Design an enzyme around this catalytic site. Sequence first.
Site, PDB file in Angstrom:
ATOM      1  N   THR A  83       0.848  -1.182   0.000  1.00 41.75           N
ATOM      2  CA  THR A  83       0.000   0.000   0.000  1.00 41.75           C
ATOM      3  C   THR A  83       0.885   1.233   0.000  1.00 41.75           C
ATOM      4  O   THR A  83       1.792   1.363   0.852  1.00 41.75           O
ATOM      5  CB  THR A  83      -0.969   0.043   1.198  1.00 41.75           C
ATOM      6  N   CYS A 197      -1.742   4.185  -6.100  1.00 45.18           N
ATOM      7  CA  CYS A 197      -2.559   3.389  -5.190  1.00 45.18           C
ATOM      8  C   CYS A 197      -2.528   1.972  -5.752  1.00 45.18           C
ATOM      9  O   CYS A 197      -2.652   1.790  -6.966  1.00 45.18           O
ATOM     10  CB  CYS A 197      -3.989   3.914  -5.054  1.00 45.18           C
TER      11      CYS A 197
END
Lengths: 235, 235
Positions: A83, A197
């Site tokens: 992430t 992302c």
Amino acid sequence: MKTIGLLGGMSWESTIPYYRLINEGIKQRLGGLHSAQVLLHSVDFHEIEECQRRGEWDKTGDILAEAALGLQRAGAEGIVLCTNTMHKVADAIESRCTLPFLHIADATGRAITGAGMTRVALLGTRYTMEQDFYRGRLTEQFSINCLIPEADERAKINQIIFEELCLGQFTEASRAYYAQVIARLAEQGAQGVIFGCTEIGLLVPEERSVLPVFDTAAIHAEDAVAFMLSLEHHH
Amino acid sequence: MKTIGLLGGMSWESTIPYYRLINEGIKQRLGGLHSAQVLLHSVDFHEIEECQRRGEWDKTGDILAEAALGLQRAGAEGIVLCTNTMHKVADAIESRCTLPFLHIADATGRAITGAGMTRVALLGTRYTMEQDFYRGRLTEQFSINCLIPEADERAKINQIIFEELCLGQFTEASRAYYAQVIARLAEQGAQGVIFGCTEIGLLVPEERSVLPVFDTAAIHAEDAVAFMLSLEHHH
């Protein structure tokens, strides 16, 4: 090979590509039935994402650093955080866990450097795009500058991440919106686009981007493979 | 929720369905951005599969029991072994690791029982089909009898597992072969078919089976979800 420790479930939809690509990299290099030695800690993302909205970043540092320690105690030899957003608290993980920490932005900045680019578009959560932690590392460590979308575009990109992509919904309306934002940043002079992302690559195929694509998940997985097999920058 | 500990990479291709289905079960029951608390240990399958061929089962018990312990030390609250074959050494894991061990054949036998069946076809590796450890538990615990393919068919089913499915190759020639073997066992009176290698469901869609399908991976994932949320037989 060295055992990689994955911090994932942020969301689990993008953790699957890490696991697939790391196993495929190991298969490609060692052949036969060889597969990757992986330890994975997958969180309940609700707690993490709720902390993001409440600004409880220290709590997420605690959760992820304790997770990294758990994987170390089971035999992990390095840490990969699946992430971009949660590298806002990488310092808490690195301070507590003595394992090599393969920072996602370092792998990405090495890729952008190798492409000879210094000005790239950055799509991600609003935290990644707007705050200092991710872009500031790219500026300080690689002298790479990021262009980010206009404030309305950023709100929508971010809503699509959390309300669709992390829930497994990949709509053409959202795909087209992302592709239009990329084209606009290309108009503004962006040389490439960071899918910053780890879910974005599940929505937008590279053929849909008018800019060369740096998919942070795919680059981070290749980084992990090089670390596990002590290749290239990890030799 | 309770944190599930997955023993996987046997092969990694079928570990992905476990991770997807367990996260989807948690999402379905808790809603929102909730996802599963998972600890996964993924092995290098080459070592395990080589031990299978050399008959070094005790060594694999040692590898998997130490893995289960590693996950326990990181906070796992139960153990799921993502492979029918390696339940041949479940006793080593359960003896060493004090966590609840969710035996794959128990979840499957509960499903077959609920279907009111007592005579089912069994496809799997040659170890699972030919030896006593898997079928003997179904007979002793559920009074379920398995029909297995003829010796030539078993050789080919097993070769397809290791030379194609565990390598990500899902061919129509192999799909059709599996479907023909299922039809033949249906002719022999099988009431249902156990996909008793966790890769088989990646090759054979249920619509291709003339028999009702017990997919051990999917049933085991639903079992894990019930354990994590203390539902149904785990309440």
